[PDB]
Amino acid sequence: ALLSFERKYRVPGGTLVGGNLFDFWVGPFYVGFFGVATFFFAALGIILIAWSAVLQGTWNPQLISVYPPALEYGLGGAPLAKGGLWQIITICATGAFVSWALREVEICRKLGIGYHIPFAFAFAILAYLTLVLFRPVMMGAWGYAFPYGIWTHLDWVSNTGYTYGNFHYNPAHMIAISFFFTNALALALHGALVLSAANPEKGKEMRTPDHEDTFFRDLVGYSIGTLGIHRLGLLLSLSAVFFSALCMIITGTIWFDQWVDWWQWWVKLPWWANIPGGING
Amino acid sequence: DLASLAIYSFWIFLAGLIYYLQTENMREGYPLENEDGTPAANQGPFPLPKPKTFILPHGRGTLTVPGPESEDRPIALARTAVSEGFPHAPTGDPMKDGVGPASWVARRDLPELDGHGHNKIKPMKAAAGFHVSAGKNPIGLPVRGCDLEIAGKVVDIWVDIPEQMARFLEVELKDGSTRLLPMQMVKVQSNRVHVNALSSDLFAGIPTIKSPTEVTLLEEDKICGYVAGGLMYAAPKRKS
Amino acid sequence: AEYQNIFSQVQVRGPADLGMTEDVNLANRSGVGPFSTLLGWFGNAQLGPIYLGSLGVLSLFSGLMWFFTIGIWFWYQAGWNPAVFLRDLFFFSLEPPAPEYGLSFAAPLKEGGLWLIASFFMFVAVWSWWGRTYLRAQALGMGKHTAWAFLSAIWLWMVLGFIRPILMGSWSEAVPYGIFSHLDWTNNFSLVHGNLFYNPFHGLSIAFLYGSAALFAMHGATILAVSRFGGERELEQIADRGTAAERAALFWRWTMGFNATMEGIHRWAIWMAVLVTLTGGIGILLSGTVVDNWYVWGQNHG
Numbered sequence A: 001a002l003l004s005f006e007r008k009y010r011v012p013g014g015t016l017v018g019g020n021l022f023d024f025w026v027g028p029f030y031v032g033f034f035g036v037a038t039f040f041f042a043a044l045g046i047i048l049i050a051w052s053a054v055l056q057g058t059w060n061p062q063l064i065s066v067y068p069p070a071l072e073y074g075l076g077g078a079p080l081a082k083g084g085l086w087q088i089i090t091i092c093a094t095g096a097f098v099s100w101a102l103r104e105v106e107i108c109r110k111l112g113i114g115y116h117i118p119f120a121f122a123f124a125i126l127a128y129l130t131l132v133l134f135r136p137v138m139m140g141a142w143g144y145a146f147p148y149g150i151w152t153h154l155d156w157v158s159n160t161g162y163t164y165g166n167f168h169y170n171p172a173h174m175i176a177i178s179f180f181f182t183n184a185l186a187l188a189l190h191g192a193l194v195l196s197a198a199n200p201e202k203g204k205e206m207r208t209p210d211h212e213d214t215f216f217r218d219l220v221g222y223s224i225g226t227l228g229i230h231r232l233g234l235l236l237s238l239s240a241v242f243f244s245a246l247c248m249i250i251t252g253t254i255w256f257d258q259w260v261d262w263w264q265w266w267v268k269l270p271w272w273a274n275i276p277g278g279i280n281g
Numbered sequence B: 001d002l003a004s005l006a007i008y009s010f011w012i013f014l015a016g017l018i019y020y021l022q023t024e025n026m027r028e029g030y031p032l033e034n035e036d037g038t039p040a041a042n043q044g045p046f047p048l049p050k051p052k053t054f055i056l057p058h059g060r061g062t063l064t065v066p067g068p069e070s071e072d073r074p075i076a077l078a079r080t081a082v083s084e085g086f087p088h089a090p091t092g093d094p095m096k097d098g099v100g101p102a103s104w105v106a107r108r109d110l111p112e113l114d115g116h117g118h119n120k121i122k123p124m125k126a127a128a129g130f131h132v133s134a135g136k137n138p139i140g141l142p143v144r145g146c147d148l149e150i151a152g153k154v155v156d157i158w159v160d161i162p163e164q165m166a167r168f169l170e171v172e173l174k175d176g177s178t179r180l181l182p183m184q185m186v187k188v189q190s191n192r193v194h195v196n197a198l199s200s201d202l203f204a205g206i207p208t209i210k211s212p213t214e215v216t217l218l219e220e221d222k223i224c225g226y227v228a229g230g231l232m233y234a235a236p237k238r239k240s
Numbered sequence C: 001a002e003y004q005n006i007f008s009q010v011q012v013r014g015p016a017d018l019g020m021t022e023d024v025n026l027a028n029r030s031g032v033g034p035f036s037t038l039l040g041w042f043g044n045a046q047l048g049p050i051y052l053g054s055l056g057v058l059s060l061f062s063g064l065m066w067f068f069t070i071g072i073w074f075w076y077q078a079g080w081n082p083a084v085f086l087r088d089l090f091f092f093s094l095e096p097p098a099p100e101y102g103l104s105f106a107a108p109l110k111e112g113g114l115w116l117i118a119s120f121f122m123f124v125a126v127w128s129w130w131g132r133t134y135l136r137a138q139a140l141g142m143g144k145h146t147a148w149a150f151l152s153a154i155w156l157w158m159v160l161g162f163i164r165p166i167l168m169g170s171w172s173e174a175v176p177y178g179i180f181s182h183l184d185w186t187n188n189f190s191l192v193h194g195n196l197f198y199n200p201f202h203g204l205s206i207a208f209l210y211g212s213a214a215l216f217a218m219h220g221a222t223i224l225a226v227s228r229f230g231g232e233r234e235l236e237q238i239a240d241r242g243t244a245a246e247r248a249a250l251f252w253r254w255t256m257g258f259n260a261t262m263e264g265i266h267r268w269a270i271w272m273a274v275l276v277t278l279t280g281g282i283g284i285l286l287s288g289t290v291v292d293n294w295y296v297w298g299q300n301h302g
């Protein structure tokens, strides 16, 4: 079935690999080469996860967990039931995600739009790979990566965090968090703004973008504008992710002590380091 | 206990929300259709919501969605296969016929108005007293297509008055008529404006506006559609 | 090669936009400010005008009294030394009264009475600012979504500083005004209630925060990819669907098998954002009042 306006857009073309061979849909979903690749990678990944859950002895989805190889294996391979499966599933996941993005590119080309979406998505992917590939490799073992289980990954997040005291003191994490919070603030404002104009007081005519500008200027003295706010959401969102990755890529690699002590560089600057009084003198 | 109750309740609320949200987002494009226009057998588990009505400013009337859907235009495409799910081939020139990535919607053939009832987009020369405030002024540059041939020259910027931003370049062709180019589909370089989407021979085929000094939503759609369509349909003449 | 619409290539300016009048009292509107060419590469160049009525003045005098009160304490902790002040900026902290004092206003200035005064000014600032989000919309004829969304934030803020302490029986449960101190409070709060990863509302709160970032990235990316068709003109795309809105919808339909409308996406967005602080405030409010330990709670599925 098609949306009422869809047919005219369903033309040949736009594929990156295999010309017309895979140029078709299944219900709503475009396929393409990268739809085939995505299904192969994902189906395999899921099979091996199920296989891992047999080897672990549980079907409970809240208990299923796939751990990477223990630290003694370094960056080498490991028997399937002691981390090798996690390694294969990770290759599957990376295949599936990158394929997902490339399929998004094919869709973009067919529709004649910009590539911003997959490019954005590529940030989520690089953050995933920071945790499972770049950081483990820089640290020397797969075992520094996170395990694949709903609750076990949270367990990793706590252990990983508290290895460095309170992780709040990672300055790169502080910037990330600010972007995450700021982004959500902006998302709330954007959605409310557009909806307040499209859905004015009972009886009244739709408001205009001039009203939206006016509301914001009256409220805070500035309007970023309708192009502005979409540019902003993108920036905030991806900057949050960029600094997330960075907060972890440096952790256990260039800084591995307690994050809280990093800050002494500032407190110890020669010009005020010894002055008595305050909290640190 | 209270936390159990709170959390149980919240999942219930959250399912209601997803239902409201999903259904609200079926105010356009539904009912689903088969490839020949008729309603599809399977519409899914969410029903269409009760209609809502937007009152439009400046006596433009109302919009009520959901409501009767239809392209209000011909569609020069045909099936390339005997079952659902395959591409539909352009029956003509898909750039000229407005299909594929060259697609347009039959929007209203009037201009977007600002909050005062004035045309939102004007050529800069009729917009007192707008002017380029930063960046390189494209007015005067030659315009180059993806064949690397000069297709015209820029004679004005059309600007969005209320939001104060450039929306189109007006370009003049060998024959003295002009076309609008969407601002987002041109690179202003130091000595020219480059247009990757279009080869020089396709500038004449840019849909043309009925009045030199306004542009309607219908026309913006044909222009923006035609130009983007060149990404796919003019690739034999791009070039690098 | 090709151009991406993250930054503008050409700015244009005309006379400053004083805005729509509707039922706004224009006496209370400032005048336009500077135009910033720097800002213009990314969004709008026009600064001002702003609206300042009685609520606005109140809100902002109060907001400053909050900030100046915390700041006066910072200098005092610094023994009035400018160098120590900058050195120890992130370490200073205005702390609430000690448990001893319960919910009373009895506590000496240096032992948390000053925190009460700061907190009083902040309470006036925020609620009056709230009243402002509602009214500036009323005066323009707009819906009140903004006030309703800002209320979700407020809820979390109220729960942390006012409601939870009241139910807990003491001001010492509240959050201290300081950079490092507030992060120590946060960490310590999770430890003291058994790790908030076991608080199901915390897990939702996270889902929506992360979800908020995915949605805004999707949405913003999407609008930019169809801005060559006028996609950012959202309100007219809602009133008369064009090819921008259709290619948006179809990108997503073809990608994940369903999609939104130009209006509906903004509802997904308002709710994704507001559920962060909505779920969050509840999770927090339940903590210590009803649940002393989320791990333990979790062990009884409830």
Ligand code: BCL
Pocket: A097, A124, A125, A127, A128, A130, A131, A156, A157, A158, A160, A161, A162, A166, A167, A168, A173, A176, A177, A180, A241, A243, A244, A245, A246, A247, A248, C186
């Ligand atoms: C005790 C814990 C420590 C702490 C330890 C850590 C550790 C350790 C980490 C973080 C990380 C983060 N911390 Mg912390 N952090 C703490 C307290 C906080 C607090 C707070 C309120 O106190 C906040 C707001 C944060 C916030 C953050 C974020 C900046 C970041 C997580 C987002 C992210 O990276 O996404 C990036 C997004 C992804 C990785 C998702 C990618 C998804 C892929 C591409 C696709 C998935 C597809 C899926 C399988 C599809 C399924 C099928 C269906 C179709 C759906 N932390 C405390 C102090 N924090 C993490 C970080 O920065 O990671 C880089 C990190 O590793």
Ligand code: BCL
Pocket: A157, A181, A184, C126, C153, C154, C156, C157, C160, C185, C186, C187, C188, C189, C190, C195, C196, C197, C201, C202, C205, C206, C209, C276, C277, C279, C280, C281, C283, C284
């Ligand atoms: C070690 C720390 C603990 C932890 C302890 C806590 C505690 C304690 C809390 C959270 C809370 C949250 N946690 Mg946690 N959390 C942990 C680990 C994490 C991790 C991770 C490990 O990756 C993440 C991603 C998170 C994420 C989150 C957020 C989803 C959530 C806060 C939402 C928000 O928007 O707050 C920010 C939004 C606000 C605070 C609202 C502010 C609104 C007011 C009105 C603004 C006033 C501004 C003022 C006037 C100043 C004006 C200046 C202007 C410039 C003019 N936590 C670990 C387990 N977390 C909060 C929550 O809801 O928990 C359920 C919370 O209380």
Ligand SMILES: CC[C@H]1c2cc3[nH]c4c(c3C)C(=O)[C@H](C(=O)OC)c4c3nc(cc4[nH]c(cc(n2)[C@@H]1C)c(C(C)=O)c4C)[C@@H](C)[C@@H]3CCC(=O)OC/C=C(\C)CCC[C@H](C)CCC[C@H](C)CCCC(C)C
Pocket: A181, A182, A184, A185, A188, A189, A219, A220, C059, C060, C062, C063, C064, C067, C125, C126, C127, C129, C130, C133, C146, C147, C149, C150, C151, C152, C153, C273, C274, C275, C276, C277
């Ligand atoms: C839905 C959840 C998200 C959210 C939503 C949200 N926040 C909101 C809103 C919404 C819908 C508003 O409408 C409101 C707003 O107006 O935004 C523009 C707001 C708001 N969110 C704010 C902050 C905020 N929101 C946060 C978070 C969130 N907000 C959540 C992620 C956070 C975090 C993450 O911690 C913060 C810090 C404010 C920008 C604003 C509320 C403003 C307010 O209450 O003002 C009172 C205080 C003052 C008026 C003055 C403060 C003192 C200054 C620090 C001094 C500096 C200079 C001075 C202001 C200049 C004056 C000079 C004079 C000499 C003239």
Ligand SMILES: CC[C@H]1c2cc3[nH]c4c(c3C)C(=O)[C@H](C(=O)OC)c4c3nc(cc4[nH]c(cc(n2)[C@@H]1C)c(C(C)=O)c4C)[C@@H](C)[C@@H]3CCC(=O)OC/C=C(\C)CCC[C@H](C)CCC[C@H](C)CCCC(C)C
Pocket: A038, A041, A042, A043, A045, A046, A089, A092, A093, A096, A097, A100, A104, A117, A118, A120, A121, A122, A123, A124, A147, A148, A149, A150, A153, A237, A238, A241, C210, C211, C213, C214, C215, C217, C218, C221, C255, C256
């Ligand atoms: C970069 C900014 C934010 C962002 C952006 C973003 N996400 C995106 C996009 C963008 C632009 C898409 O275009 C794409 C999409 O299609 O969304 C609908 C997507 C997407 N973001 C998703 C998820 C996601 N994004 C997240 C975060 C973020 N996404 C960032 C905050 C998170 C978090 C915060 O945890 C999640 C869980 C998906 C819904 C979708 C990508 C879907 C996809 O890639 O499909 C192909 C893969 C499969 C169908 C499954 C593969 C299965 C594997 C082989 C096995 C499973 C392995 C996995 C490692 C198990 C881990 C389990 C445990 C951790 C519990």
Ligand SMILES: COC(C)(C)C/C=C/C(C)=C/C=C/C(C)=C/C=C/C(C)=C/C=C\C=C(C)\C=C\C=C(/C)CC/C=C(\C)CCC=C(C)C
Pocket: C067, C068, C070, C071, C072, C074, C116, C119, C120, C122, C123, C157, C158, C159, C160, C161, C162, C175, C176, C177, C178, C179, C182
């Ligand atoms: C340079 O020096 C000058 C003098 C210019 C000023 C400098 C000042 C400085 C450096 C200020 C720094 C301020 C900082 C860092 C503030 C940080 C604040 C933070 C992080 C606050 C975080 C959380 C706060 C919360 C959750 C507060 C909630 C508050 C409430 C809910 C209000 C509750 C109200 C109460 C208890 C009062 C009730 C009173 C009556 C009378 C009913």
Ligand SMILES: CCCCCCCCCCCC[N+](C)(C)[O-]
Pocket: B135, C007, C008, C009, C038, C039, C041, C042
């Ligand atoms: C909130 C963000 C503030 C705006 C800062 C961005 C300034 C960058 C200017 C990019 C210059 C573009 N240029 C000259 C090539 O056209």
Ligand SMILES: CCCCCCCCCCCC[N+](C)(C)[O-]
Pocket: C200, C201, C203, C204, C207, C211, C268, C271, C272
């Ligand atoms: C705008 C609504 C979108 C809904 C997103 C819902 C994601 C649910 C994720 C699981 C939550 C975790 N926990 C522990 C509470 O179960």
Ligand SMILES: CCCCCCCCCCCC[N+](C)(C)[O-]
Pocket: B002, B006, C167, C168, C169, C285, C286, C288, C289, C290
């Ligand atoms: C949904 C929020 C429900 C809050 C329930 C309030 C119960 C009040 C009893 C709190 C007990 C705490 N204390 C320390 C006084 O014992």
Ligand SMILES: [Fe+3]
Pocket: A190, A194, A230, C219, C223, C234, C266
């Ligand atoms: Fe939008």
